[PDB]
Amino acid sequence: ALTYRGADISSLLLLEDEGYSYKNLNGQTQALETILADAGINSIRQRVWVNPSDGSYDLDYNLELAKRVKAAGMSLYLDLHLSDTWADPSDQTTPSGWSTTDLGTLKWQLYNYTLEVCNTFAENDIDIEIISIGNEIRAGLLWPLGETSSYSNIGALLHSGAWGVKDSNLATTPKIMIHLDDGWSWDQQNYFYETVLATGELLSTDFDYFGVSYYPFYSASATLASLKTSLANLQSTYDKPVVVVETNWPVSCPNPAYAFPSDLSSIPFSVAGQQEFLEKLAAVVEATTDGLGVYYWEPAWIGNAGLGSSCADNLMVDYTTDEVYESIETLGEL
Ligand SMILES: *[C@@H]1O[C@H](CO)[C@@H](O[C@@H]2O[C@H](CO)[C@@H](O[C@@H]3O[C@H](CO)[C@@H](O)[C@H](O)[C@@H]3O)[C@H](O)[C@H]2NC(C)=O)[C@H](O)[C@H]1NC(C)=O
Ligand SMILES: OC[C@H]1O[C@@H](O[C@@H]2[C@H](O)[C@@H](O)[C@H](O)O[C@@H]2CO)[C@H](O)[C@@H](O)[C@H]1O
Numbered sequence: 001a002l003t004y005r006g007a008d009i010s011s012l013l014l015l016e017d018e019g020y021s022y023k024n025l026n027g028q029t030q031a032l033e034t035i036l037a038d039a040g041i042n043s044i045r046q047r048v049w050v051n052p053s054d055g056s057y058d059l060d061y062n063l064e065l066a067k068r069v070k071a072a073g074m075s076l077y078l079d080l081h082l083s084d085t086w087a088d089p090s091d092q093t094t095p096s097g098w099s100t101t102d103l104g105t106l107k108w109q110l111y112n113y114t115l116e117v118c119n120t121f122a123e124n125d126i127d128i129e130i131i132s133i134g135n136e137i138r139a140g141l142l143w144p145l146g147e148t149s150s151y152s153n154i155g156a157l158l159h160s161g162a163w164g165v166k167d168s169n170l171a172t173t174p175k176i177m178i179h180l181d182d183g184w185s186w187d188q189q190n191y192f193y194e195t196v197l198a199t200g201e202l203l204s205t206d207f208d209y210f211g212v213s214y215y216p217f218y219s220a221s222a223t224l225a226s227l228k229t230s231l232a233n234l235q236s237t238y239d240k241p242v243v244v245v246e247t248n249w250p251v252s253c254p255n256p257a258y259a260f261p262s263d264l265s266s267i268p269f270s271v272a273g274q275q276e277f278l279e280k281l282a283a284v285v286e287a288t289t290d291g292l293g294v295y296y297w298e299p300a301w302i303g304n305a306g307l308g309s310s311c312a313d314n315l316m317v318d319y320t321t322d323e324v325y326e327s328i329e330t331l332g333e334l
């Protein structure tokens with residue numbers, strides 16, 4: 001098995017608030033984290049926002065959710081969006097209150113944030129396994145100061161964030177991840193790290209794990225073969241372990257906006273499809289020297305079945321009954 005077989009279920013507490021509830025494989029209502037834990041899912045990924053208006057995905061939200069993850073027996077991976085809202089390669093909005101004008105000041109705010117996110121978690125007695133300094137930061141983070149016009153700035157902000165983690169009172173220090181999208185592209189992956197490390201503002205010893213996203217429905221170049229190479233090259237070149245931290249496969253996709261990659265076009269859009277996909281992905285990752293795991297993105301997000309894609313349903317739960325699909329078991333045995 002993979003060391004880590006996970007899911008990001010950040011939406012859970014918001015969805016429980018609206019009324020919703022989940023059924024296990026045997027038709028009995030049960031808390032989603034216990035259902036998942038029972039399937040072999042050993043790790044839960046959670047997105048963190050800094051000061052969202054309505055408190056979605058804030059620190060308090062995450063402590064509430066992480067207690068339940070801890071209780072259930074699973075490890076915790078915090079995905080620091082380092083923003084008040086969605087962070088991705090086309091939106092990296094600096095948190096309100098943080099500097100859009102002074103790097104010296106933004107670095108301090110970031111150090112303080114990671115330090116004290118960590119110290120609060122240590123205070124509430126919750127262990128953190130993985131913390132990412134940004135979500136999908138290939139186009140940088142904390143705009144404008146960390147836009148890709150300044151890899152020197154990005155490198156320096158990462159160093160600040162990492163150092164807040166190291167300096168916290170966590171009994172065990174979380175493994176620090178840098179997370180880029182387009183995991184399949186070695187040129188994208190390598191370009192970021194060589195350019196940033198070349199500056200000398202990020203040190204190789206500032207972080208522990210590579211994270212990558214790997215989605216099949218945003219470009220026909222996302223071949224399993226291209227991912228195998230990207231992952232192997234990241235590891236050979238920089239001597240660090242690699243994790244696929246976000247992936248989906250549709251159980252229904254009638255109007256894709258992009259051709260699926262050539263080595264995945266024979267996989268159906270069904271629950272069985274999801275399993276075959278996850279198995280083929282897991283094999284790539286098992287065979288990568290030091291390939292530690294796979295996390296599915298938002299398997300249970302009722303009312304957002306498309307999960308942002310041009311595909312109709314990417315969930316691992318039946319949204320007509322709120323019952324989890326068998327694909328959850330395949331995820332847990334990867
Ligand atoms: C540095 O980072 C923290 C983390 O976001 C910023 O928010 C402040 O966090 C501290 C530490 O958790 C809070 O203080 C603590 O509050 C609890 C409950 O009231 C109390 O039991 C602890 O003993 C401690 O006082 C603080 O309230 C919170 N502040 C805000 C405005 O939310 C902090 O502000 C950052 N620092 C700067 C100077 O920007
Ligand atoms: O509700 C959809 C939501 O998707 C967000 O993006 C997620 C994820 O956070 C990213 O890390 C990844 O690149 O893509 C997925 C969507 O497939 C997005 O940031 C939001 O704007 C929403 O569309």
Ligand SMILES: [Ca+2]
Binds near residue numbers: 013
């Ligand atoms: Ca609640």
Ligand SMILES: [Ca+2]
Binds near residue numbers: 025
């Ligand atoms: Ca069974």
Ligand SMILES: [Ca+2]
Binds near residue numbers: 037038039040
């Ligand atoms: Ca079980």
Ligand SMILES: [Ca+2]
Binds near residue numbers: 147
């Ligand atoms: Ca730009």
